[PDB]
Ligand binder design. Sequence first.
Ligand SMILES: CCCCCCCCCCCCCCCCCC(=O)OC[C@H](COP(=O)([O-])OCC(O)COP(=O)([O-])OC[C@@H](COC(=O)CCCCCCCCCCCCCCCCC)OC(=O)CCCCCCCCCCCCCCCCC)OC(=O)CCCCCCCCCCCCCCCCC
Ligand SMILES: CCCCCCCCCCCCCCCCC[C@@H](O)O[C@H](CO[C@H](O)CCCCCCCCCCCCCCC)COP(=O)(O)OCC[N+](C)(C)C
Ligand SMILES: CCCCCCCCCCCCCCCCC[C@@H](O)O[C@H](CO[C@H](O)CCCCCCCCCCCCCCC)COP(=O)(O)OCC[N+](C)(C)C
Ligand SMILES: CCCCCCCC/C=C\CCCCCCCC(=O)O[C@H](COC(=O)CCCCCCC/C=C/CCCCCCCC)COP(=O)(O)OCCN
Ligand SMILES: Nc1ncnc2c1ncn2[C@@H]1O[C@H](COP(=O)(O)OP(=O)(O)O)[C@@H](O)[C@H]1O
Lengths: 98, 347, 320, 55, 56, 459, 49, 122
Amino acid sequence: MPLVYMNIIMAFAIALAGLLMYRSHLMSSLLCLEGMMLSLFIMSTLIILNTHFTLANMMPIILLVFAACEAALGLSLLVMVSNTYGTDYVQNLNLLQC
Amino acid sequence: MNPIIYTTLIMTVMSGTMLVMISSHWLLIWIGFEMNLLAMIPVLMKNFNPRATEAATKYFLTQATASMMLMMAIIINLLYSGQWTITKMFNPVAMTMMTMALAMKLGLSPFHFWVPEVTQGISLQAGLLLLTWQKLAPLSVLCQISQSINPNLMLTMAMLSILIGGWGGLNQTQLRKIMAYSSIAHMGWMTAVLPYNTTMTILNLLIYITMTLAMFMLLIHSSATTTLSLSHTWNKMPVITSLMMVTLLSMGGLPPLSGFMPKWMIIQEMTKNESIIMPTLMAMTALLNLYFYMRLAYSSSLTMFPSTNNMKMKWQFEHTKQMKLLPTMIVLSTLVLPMTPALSSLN
Amino acid sequence: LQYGPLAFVLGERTTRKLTETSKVITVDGNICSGKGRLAREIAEKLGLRHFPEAGIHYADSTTGDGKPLDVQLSGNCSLEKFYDDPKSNDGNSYRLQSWLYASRLLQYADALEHLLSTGQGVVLERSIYSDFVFLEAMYRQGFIRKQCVEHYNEVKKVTACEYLPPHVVVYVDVPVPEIQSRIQKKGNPHEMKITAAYLQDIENAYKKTFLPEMSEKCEVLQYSAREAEDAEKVVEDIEYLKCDKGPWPDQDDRTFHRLRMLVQNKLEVLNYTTIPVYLPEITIGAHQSDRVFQKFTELPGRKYSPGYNEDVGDKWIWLK
Amino acid sequence: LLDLIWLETILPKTTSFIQMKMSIMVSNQKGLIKLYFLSFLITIMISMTLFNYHE
Amino acid sequence: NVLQIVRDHWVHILVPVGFVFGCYLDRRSDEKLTAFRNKSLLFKRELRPNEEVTWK
Amino acid sequence: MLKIIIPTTMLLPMTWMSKHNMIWINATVHSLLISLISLSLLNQLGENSLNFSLTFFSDSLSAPLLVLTTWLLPLMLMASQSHLSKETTTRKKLYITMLILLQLFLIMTFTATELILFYILFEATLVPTLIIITRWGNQTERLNAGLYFLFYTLAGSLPLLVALVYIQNTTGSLNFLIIHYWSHPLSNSWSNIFMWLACIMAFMVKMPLYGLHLWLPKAHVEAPIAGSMVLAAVLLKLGGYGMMRITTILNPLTNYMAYPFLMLSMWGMIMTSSICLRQTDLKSLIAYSSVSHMALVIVAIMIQTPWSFMGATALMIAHGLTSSMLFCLANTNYERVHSRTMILARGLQTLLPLMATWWLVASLTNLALPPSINLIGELFIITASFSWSNITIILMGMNMMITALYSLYMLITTQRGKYTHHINNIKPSFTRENALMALHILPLLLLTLNPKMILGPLY
Amino acid sequence: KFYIREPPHGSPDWLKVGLTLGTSVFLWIYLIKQHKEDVLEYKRRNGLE
Amino acid sequence: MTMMSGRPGRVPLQFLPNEARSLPPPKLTDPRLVYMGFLGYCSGLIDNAIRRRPVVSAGLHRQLLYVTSFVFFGYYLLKRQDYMYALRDHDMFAYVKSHPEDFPEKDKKTYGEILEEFHPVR
Ligand SMILES: CCCCCCCCCCCCCCCCCC(=O)OC[C@H](COP(=O)([O-])OCC(O)COP(=O)([O-])OC[C@@H](COC(=O)CCCCCCCCCCCCCCCCC)OC(=O)CCCCCCCCCCCCCCCCC)OC(=O)CCCCCCCCCCCCCCCCC
Ligand SMILES: CCCCCCCCCCCCCCCCC[C@@H](O)O[C@H](CO[C@H](O)CCCCCCCCCCCCCCC)COP(=O)(O)OCC[N+](C)(C)C
Ligand SMILES: CCCCCCCCCCCCCCCCC[C@@H](O)O[C@H](CO[C@H](O)CCCCCCCCCCCCCCC)COP(=O)(O)OCC[N+](C)(C)C
Ligand SMILES: CCCCCCCC/C=C\CCCCCCCC(=O)O[C@H](COC(=O)CCCCCCC/C=C/CCCCCCCC)COP(=O)(O)OCCN
Ligand SMILES: Nc1ncnc2c1ncn2[C@@H]1O[C@H](COP(=O)(O)OP(=O)(O)O)[C@@H](O)[C@H]1O
């Protein structure tokens, strides 16, 4: 493979680890989700352009649309959490246990 | 919520699940999952409270992570083969990502932590939907790619799911958490047989869905979410408690009840493949689920707990809303063992 | 077509029936005050439906035949023996208070259902909002325990927050000596034993907690004993009130639909009355519970659903 | 010594004690998503190494 | 005179009818296992001039 | 076989359609009629079994057990109706329904041709017994007793299910006839050893084997009278019947796989007989005596000789009848004085002479007086053990001595001496109780005239 | 006897009862005809009758 | 893990292929159909019990509809199940016929000439 493929894959891995490891702010994790989506977009676009598969040139656009849907969902949930607690910290979300 | 809006959201959830069901293209399956999650998030929050908000947030985070892993696996599979069809993945790493993603979507161990909390934080109707309808799509995807799964990882996750479901259910007094741990154990049982026979997985899915629907409807009818609240139902609706006790015995897998048939068929199918140790451990561990079912039956129907004075006023009122399918679900959850050979129609 | 989501979707709405005369009205006052006559007169003048004060057997009036049932099958408390022995070690006092709160909750649900379904207004004597004055009076007189007050507060917190407060709160003011004098002139031997401290506690609870609390979300009309006989004047005072204070103007079709779904289905209304808090005064053992439940089921029209008891003349059961 | 103590100790009481301890260990979680997602990362790292390298 | 006693004692026929039905079903089940009738090497026999089967 | 099953099922709508004051009469009459009908299965062919159809068959081993179950149901109904008088009509009908379902599962269990159906019914017997024990038991320990009874059984039974499906996969069938005719030796391997254990331990724990018997005192003491009757008389024999059916395919491994079980059974029968000597509860003594008798049955089954199986069958039948009679006798006194302590009520012979006669006859049959069938089975088992090894006679004689000792100890403690002064509520014996004791005891003595009816297929 | 509406009154809902009975009758007749057609088709395909 | 879903010439969503019509339909007195009707009757009785109606006599039309629906569905369920088992046997026999080298017929010996080991019981 090209080394750019490894760079994009490691970008995805770093963003996934950033999401999986949580600091105080909820907003930081949403940004990590958006970063994973961006890396997926870049990787899929590179794969589609390299192989000249004409019909999937539209697939990353659909990816972006559902990324926007995910981001809107996350922001709405953050609005409700911050309205409840006055802060978007994840440690406030501990009313429910296992 | 406007009833029209609620109907539209439920139809959107169902249509996303059906899109996952009928698609031949990986992108369309991903789209179905995305639409299902998007329409599912408001349903968890229909009755607004901080607990519902927290449950919805945890659910969204878990499912979004699973969706990201799903898409990454699809992209790897495309990279190593210019294929979009869901037939059999061509890369072991992509397949491992796919398995981890689908297990996180299903709530299999060790990705089980979200299920009890989300189930506890929502209403009983949302819990019913989450524990019945939300399992169809990832299970269908796993059924389509069954020949590609690594048996070691899948069976490890299934055994962990059964063990953790039993142990977690041992410690619960809230009914929703009990049902969530029961769901985790049943998912483990279902995914244990998937690498060998998808028909067994489908049969286990159908029986588990029937029993879970009957149990959740019985819990809605007697509007209780804790053990002590359900302990009062004998003094107002003894028939409901008796049906609950019989359904609980069925869920424990005791013959000649219906819940025994999926475990029996899974064990015999696994023995056909020279797998003896793991089904033995699986049954010996489902003994724990039977134990906490029996504890609930002791507290609910077989003995009579003390009641309160205000129950006399409740004695004078009937149920305004009646559930149409509750009688059928109870009968199918209990008395369908003699109809076992009908499973051939599932393949 | 029973009211539900289907009825709300096609056609049926609540706001289209509000006609400026709905005005949930409660006419409160101390013991033996003429609040009942004033409330009935207000209902007759304004054309609203009148609700007599909810007693021990209010639930009996709404189910089956309107006849009351036996005390041990309904209520399991006596107001007379509360006057006789308020400190009895059988828990009669708090049992009576909790049963009366449940009855008032049921009556409030029925009145709200009537107003939301027909648009016609309702008039209530007391309410779940003013029920706590008796609880506070009992607690200050040493009639109930602190735990009983805590359980009452828990039940009220989980129940009364689901409903809209009344538009108009009418308080009939009678000084405690006049209350006592009316008590002796009445003739009931049990009410003769009501001490002045108990009535003073009720009046203090009213004037220090209830009226200031309702004045923030409702408009209050106070009337002395002498000026409470002028029903026409009180009605004229009500007819010239601007209801721009409480949450009622903040209500649209969806909140009305939720409230109408809640006011019917009386089991959902009463759900949180029987919470598993084990107070000795209200906890009933398994044997007594079983015996009383069987005896209730042996009542002539209570074994089956209303239209399915053939011994009270129901017909075509095999085709129902 | 045998029926009331040791036969009780070996089969049923040991099982009850072990299952109670395991249930307490499994079900006593603080409800913080930080710990859960850290465990998710650990599990992912294991599956890709102890399983994904073996085929 | 018999209407009320029938209405209060009709339950006493369920078990005898079940017994008769069980015997009838046992005969029907016997009817499905006639593959080796008069075919065993030990009991194979020549039919009587008027009989049709060796057992039923 | 349908002529037995269908009336048993018809018992359910018949008792659900009965009047509130006629349920006991109707159920008893039709249960007795069903027992009379089932009595016709004792006509056995000798060479082979009675194969009614593909699903059911009757053997010389199954027929006495079926007759015992059908005969036990009316006695259970007679014993139950006294302590259930205050119950509502619906709950009494539910109790009778539990009894009828238990009878149906038992009669189907003993006649199944195929081992998976036998397993399904043999597990299905659990639910009615559990419901009876945990709902109509008297004390607060009934919940713990039910949990013990359920989980001890299931922990042994699940490996049996795994072994059965594996065996059907490897052989192609589990039908008992095909299993017997196509039997092949089990080699000496770890896989075969664990297959043997999985095929044996469920029936071991149902007997129960000593060391796995802790559930039995709890369940038998904490259950109502009918529950104890069915637990001691019939449900203990499921393990023995299963062993006799399953050891056909276990040879030649049983030759040395039976050593720990034989050792456990002999020493534990000694231990339980000794335990009966120091017991403050009257029902626990009967339970432990049952454990000792079933240990002797386990030895008889393990040694695999025709005389051993004949003695085991006779001992199973005799023990069932005797244990049911003893439990009923204890229940009468418990109903009188509302306590299970043996020394609370003494000198009952002065107050109840006929019940004292019933006590004496039951104690004599418990110690296996000749020529009762109890001693027939015990002597056959002892002779078979002596053929197996001459040193077994020491343990057999010790067990006989201790059995006589605690039997007569119970009789003397309960019936002899002087009455307790303060206890003044001991009423004369009812016709129902005396009739129940007579209906227990008379078949026992009548079986002596025709011992071959209960000796089994090896006769 | 009863105080209020009691939606099941002395007479039953004849529309609902008629619809239920008609549904049952139609289902039974359809099943009978389907079984007859199945038997005839099976005989014709295998040349029995 | 998916045995017969990919069988050639399989129409996706029929539930009853035309080839199934060559098989004998189940009899209308089939014990499995009787059990389905009994299940419908139990559903009707439970429906009566839950709604606090007379369990045995309240809804006769409803119980009739329950039994009829259960029998109607069970008939087609039995047809599909029998057809699937017929397909399984057909495919098995065809495969056995087409692969004689994997299912050989070896001469069977009589028991007088097969030596079995004897294990005495003692
Ligand atoms: C294997 C071979 C075949 C076996 C068959 C399978 C087993 C039986 C079938 C199961 C389903 C059928 C019945 C289900 C619906 C019934 C629901 C009910 O509650 O019944 C009340 C009802 C009595 O109430 P009512 O008459 O309306 O008035 C009294 C009041 O309601 C006063 O009532 P209440 O509600 O106020 O009383 C309160 C009571 C209310 O509690 C109950 O009533 C218990 C009901 C539990 C429902 C059963 C679960 C669902 C089915 C699963 C069965 C599993 C079987 C496997 C073995 C496991 C055993 C658990 O609560 C309690 O007292 C606490 C009890 C807790 C103790 C734990 C035991 C409870 C569970 C035991 C279930 C055993 C299986 C069902 C036995 C039959 C029960 C009726 O029972 C009946 O009258 C109907 C029973 C059947 C009659 C129909 C027979 C047809 C007529 C003859 C025609 C002949 C046909 C053949 C022709 C031959 C030619 C002539
Ligand atoms: C309280 C009551 C509970 C129920 C009791 C159940 C009793 C179960 C015991 C099973 C009986 C014996 C099992 C197997 C028979 C022989 C076992 C072994 O010790 O024998 C030697 C086996 O050699 C070694 O000992 C191997 C076994 C050593 C490991 C086993 C651990 C034993 C420790 C005791 C643990 C307690 C077990 C029960 C837990 C409750 C024989 O030597 P060899 O001829 O070469 O091997 C024969 C097998 N071949 C043919 C396949 C080769
Ligand atoms: C608790 C008991 C289970 C209850 C299950 C729910 C019962 C209600 C369902 C309503 C029945 C209608 C469903 C189907 C009717 C038409 C649809 C039909 O065309 O589907 C076909 C298939 O038919 C259905 O799948 C058969 C459904 C029958 C379910 C009953 C089996 C239950 C197991 C044994 C218990 C006995 C139940 C007793 C009945 C109450 C399509 O075949 P195919 O597209 O190629 O297969 C898809 C799956 N593949 C590709 C992965 C193989
Ligand atoms: C309530 C108390 C009762 C306890 C009873 C529990 C004992 C049950 C007996 C053992 C259970 C497991 C048996 C497994 C089922 C047998 C099937 C079989 O024979 O398969 C074996 C498989 O054998 C095994 O896998 C057995 C391994 C053991 C797994 C679980 C071990 C748990 C503890 C075992 C010892 C305890 C059993 C006796 C204790 C009794 C109670 C104290 C061989 O198959 P293949 O792989 O094809 O080999 C031939 C081709 N190469
Ligand atoms: N919540 C309550 N707690 C205790 N007693 C109550 C309560 N509500 C009403 N009562 C009793 O109702 C009796 C008379 O009711 P009241 O309205 O004061 O007089 P009137 O019948 O003239 O309207 C009083 O003896 C009073 O104690």
